[PDB]
From Swiss-Prot, chain B:
The chain holds residues 55 to 108 of 430 of the full protein. Interacts (via N-terminus) with the capsid assembly scaffolding protein (via C-terminus); capsid proteins and scaffolding proteins form building blocks that assemble to form the procapsid. Interacts with the portal protein. It is found in: Virion. Self-assembles to form an icosahedral capsid with a T=7 symmetry. The insertion domain (I domain) plays an important role in the folding of the capsid protein by acting as an intramolecular chaperone. This is Major capsid protein.
Length: 54, 54
């Protein structure tokens, strides 16, 4: 079980560290009405405009 | 369980650890009353007291 968990941690950390597409917000997600949607949608918008393969 | 990384693990083998939790017992809960023989001629209050005790 612990070895599986370590694999999970390594994958998550590599993703977070080598992530070029930084979506930034000045405030916490609970602040405005649809910050979570806006935040996912910023991710989608930058992936679309950069013309990445999805 | 703990895990470690690396090829060489000389003098780094851990041990085994099993924790324990104990359940115990409480005090008995009682319903105690008495009656005289002249009070058992009706016997209704006795049965109702048994029900209330449960």
């Amino acid at each position: 079980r612990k070895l599986a968990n370590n694999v999970e941690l390594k994958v998550a950390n590599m993703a977070a560290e080598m992530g070029s597409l930084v979506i930034t917000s000045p405030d916490a997600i609970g602040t405005n009405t649809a910050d979570a949607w806006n935040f996912v949608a910023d991710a989608e918008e930058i992936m679309f405009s950069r013309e990445l393969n999805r | 369980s703990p895990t470690q990384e690396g090829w060489d693990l000389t003098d780094k083998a851990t041990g085994l650890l099993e924790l324990n939790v104990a359940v115990n017992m409480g005090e008995p809960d009682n319903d105690f009353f008495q009656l005289r023989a002249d009070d058992l001629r009706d016997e209704t209050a006795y049965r109702r007291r048994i029900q209330s005790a449960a």
